[PDB]
Amino acid sequence: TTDEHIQEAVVAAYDPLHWPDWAFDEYNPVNLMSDIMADDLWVGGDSKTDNQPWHLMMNFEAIPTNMIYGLWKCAYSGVKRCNDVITYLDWATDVTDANRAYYEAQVIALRVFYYNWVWKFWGNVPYFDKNEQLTADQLYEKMVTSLEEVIQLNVLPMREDSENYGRVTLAMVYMLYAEIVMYQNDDSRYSTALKYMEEIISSPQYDLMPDYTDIFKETGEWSIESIFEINYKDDNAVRDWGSPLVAGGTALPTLISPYIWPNGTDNHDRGWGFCPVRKETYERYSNNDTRRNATCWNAQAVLDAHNAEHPDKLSYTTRYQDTGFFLEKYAAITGNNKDQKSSSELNWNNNLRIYRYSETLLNAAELITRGAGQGDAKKYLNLVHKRAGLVTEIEPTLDNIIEERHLEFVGEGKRYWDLIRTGKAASVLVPDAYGYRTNSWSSSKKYLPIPQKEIDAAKGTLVQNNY
Numbered sequence: 469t470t471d472e473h474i475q476e477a478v479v480a481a482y483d484p485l486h487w488p489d490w491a492f493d494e495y496n497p498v499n500l501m502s503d504i505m506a507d508d509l510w511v512g513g514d515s516k517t518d519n520q521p522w523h524l525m526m527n528f529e530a531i532p533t534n535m536i537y538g539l540w541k542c543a544y545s546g547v548k549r550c551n552d553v554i555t556y557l558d559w560a561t562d563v564t565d566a567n568r569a570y571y572e573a574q575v576i577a578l579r580v581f582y583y584n585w586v587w588k589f590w591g592n593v594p595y596f597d598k599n600e601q602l603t604a605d606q607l608y609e610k611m612v613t614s615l616e617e618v619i620q621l622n623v624l625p626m627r628e629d630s631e632n633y634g635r636v637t638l639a640m641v642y643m644l645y646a647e648i649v650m651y652q653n654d655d656s657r658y659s660t661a662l663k664y665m666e667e668i669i670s671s672p673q674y675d676l677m678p679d680y681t682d683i684f685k686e687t688g689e690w691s692i693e694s695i696f697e698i699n700y701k702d703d704n705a706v707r708d709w710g711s712p713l714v715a716g717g718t719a720l721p722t723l724i725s726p727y728i729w730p731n732g733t734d735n736h737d738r739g740w741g742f743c744p745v746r747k748e749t750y751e752r753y754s755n756n757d758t759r760r761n762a763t764c765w766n767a768q769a770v771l772d773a774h775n776a777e778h779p780d781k782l783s784y785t786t787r788y789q790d791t792g793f794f795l796e797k798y799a800a801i802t803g804n805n806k807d808q809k810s811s812s813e814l815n816w817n818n819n820l821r822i823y824r825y826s827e828t829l830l831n832a833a834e835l836i837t838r839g840a841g842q843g844d845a846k847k848y849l850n851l852v853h854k855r856a857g858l859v860t861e862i863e864p865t866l867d868n869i870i871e872e873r874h875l876e877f878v879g880e881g882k883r884y885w886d887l888i889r890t891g892k893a894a895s896v897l898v899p900d901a902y903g904y905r906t907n908s909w910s911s912s913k914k915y916l917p918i919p920q921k922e923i924d925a926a927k928g929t930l931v932q933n934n935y
C-alpha cells in the first residue's frame with residue numbers, strides 16, 4: 469500500500485535468480501542444466517546415479533518421475549513474486565509516476581526472465597500474470613509483448629552504478645529480447661533485435677575486456693563487458709543446506725571442481741568432479757586461442773608437473789567421465805569462499821555471467837546474416853575472434869558465427885539452445901565414441917518431461933510433453 473513496502477517486494481522478486489544451483493533439495497545450476505545436453509562437457513560425479521536426472525537429460529532419456537524439479541519451482545517462485553508487485557502497485561498511493569514505472573519495468577523484465585527458464589526447458593507450461601497451459605508459441609507471444617511494454621516505459625538506465633549492479637537495465641532487457649526472438653526464430657522481430665544490439669554497441673559503457681582471462685575472475689565481475697550477472701558473495705554469506713534461499717554464495721564451483729584436489733595447489737580447491745570438460749573441447753581450440761586455458765583447466769598436467777618439480781606424489785581422485793580437464797570459468801579458486809560464515813560449499817563468490825558484450829556482437833553479426841538489415845557483421849565477428857588472440861580474420865558466415873559462439877561460451881548455458889534454434893542439434897548431438905551418449909537428439913527432445921507431481925496435481929489440466 470506504501471512505496472517502501474513495494475521497494476522491499478521488488479528486491480524479493482530478484483531472489484529466485486540466485487536459487488536454482490541449490491534449492492528445493494536439488495542442484496539445478498541453470499547454465500549446466502543446458503550445457504550437459506550439448507557437446508562440450510561430460511556429467512561426472514561418482515557415477516550415472518549421482519545427480520541421476522543430469523545423466524538422463526544428457527542422454528535424451530529424462531523421465532517425469534526422475535526430472536530436475538528445483539528449477540521449475542525457482543522460476544514459478546520468481547513469477548509469483550513479480551505478480552505480487554504488479555497487484556500491490558494497483559493498491560499503492562503517493563508512489564511517483566517515475567517510481568511506479570521503475571518498479572513495473574523491473575518486475576515485468578524479471579517475470580519474462582523466469583518464464584524464459586521454463587519456456588526453454590519445458591516449452592508448454594502454465595502461464596499467469598496475476599496470482600492455464602500455453603503452447604511454447606503462446607508463452608513466446610506473452611513474453612515478447614511484456615518486454616515491448618518494459619522498453620516503452622522508457623525508465624530503465626542503459627547501465628547501473630557500483631551500488632545497484634544486478635538490477636534490471638535496458639541493456640539486460642535488450643539481450644533478453646534478442647535471446648527469445650532468436651530462440652523462437654521470429655524473423656519479424658530480427659530488425660528490432662538488431663537495432664537494440666546496435667544501441668548496446670553504440671554505448672561507450674559496454675565493450676570487450678581486452679584479456680579474456682580477466683572475465684571470470686572476481687575482479688571481472690560487472691566489468692565493461694558485463695550486461696547482466698546473478699550476484700553471489702562470500703562476504704559474511706550464510707546460505708546453508710536447510711536455508712538455501714538466503715542471498716549468499718553459489719554451490720557451482722563445489723559441484724564442478726576435482727574430487728579431493730589438494731586445496732591451494734595452483735590456487736585451486738576441491739569439489740565433487742561434475743562436468744569434466746571433454747578432451748574434444750580442449751582440442752577444438754587453436755594453440756593461439758586464449759579461451760582454451762580460460763575454459764579448460766588441465767588439473768592432471770598441473771599435478772604431473774608438480775610431481776616432477778617436487779617428487780610427494782600428489783593426485784586428485786578421478787570420478788566418472790574424468791578427462792583431466794575441468795571448467796576453469798567456474799572452478800573453485802582458493803580464497804573465493806574465505807569470508808563466508810556458514811557451509812563453505814554453498815558460499816562461493818563467483819557471479820553467474822548471463823549476458824556479456826561478446827554475445828551482443830555475435831547476436832548483431834548473426835541478425836545481419838539472417839536479413840535483419842545492414843551492419844558490419846564481419847567487424848563484429850572479428851572483434852570477438854581477435855580478442856581471443858586469433859590474428860587471421862574470418863568471414864561472417866552463419867557457420868563461422870555459430871562456431872565463434874561455441875568457442876566463446878562453454879559452460880555459460882548457450883550451446884544447447886544455439887544447436888536447437890539453428891537446426892544443428894539433430895546432426896551434432898549423436899552417440900559419441902566413448903559410449904556415454906548412446907541416444908540421438910530429435911525434435912521430440914526439444915522440451916523435457918514436465919515433473920510427474922505437476923501432471924498429477926493439475927488433474928488433466930497440464931498435458932505431458934511427448935519427449
Ligand SMILES: OC[C@H]1O[C@@H](O[C@@H]2[C@@H](O)[C@H](O[C@@H]3[C@@H](O)[C@H](O[C@@H]4[C@@H](O)[C@H](O[C@@H]5[C@@H](O)[C@H](O[C@@H]6[C@@H](O)[C@H](O)O[C@H](CO)[C@H]6O)O[C@H](CO)[C@H]5O)O[C@H](CO)[C@H]4O)O[C@H](CO)[C@H]3O)O[C@H](CO)[C@H]2O)[C@H](O)[C@@H](O)[C@@H]1O
Nearest residue numbers: 495513514518519706707708709710711740809810811813
Ligand atoms: O550428489 C552431490 C554430492 O553430494 C554430496 O553430499 C552432500 C552432503 O555432503 C551435504 O551434507 C550436509 C553437510 O554439508 C552438513 O554439514 C555440517 C555443516 O553444514 C555445518 O556447518 C555450520 C553451518 O551450518 C553454520 O551455519 C549457520 C547458519 O545456518 C545460520 O543460519 O547462521 C549462522 C551465522 O549467523 C551460521 O553459523 O555455520 C557454522 C560455522 O559457524 C558451520 O560450521 O557444520 C558441520 C561441521 O561442524 C557440518 O557437519 O551437514 C548437513 C546436515 O544436514 C548435511 O546435509 O548434503 C548435501 C545435500 O543433501 C549432499 O549433496 C556427496 O557427498 C557427494 O558424493 C555427491 O557427489
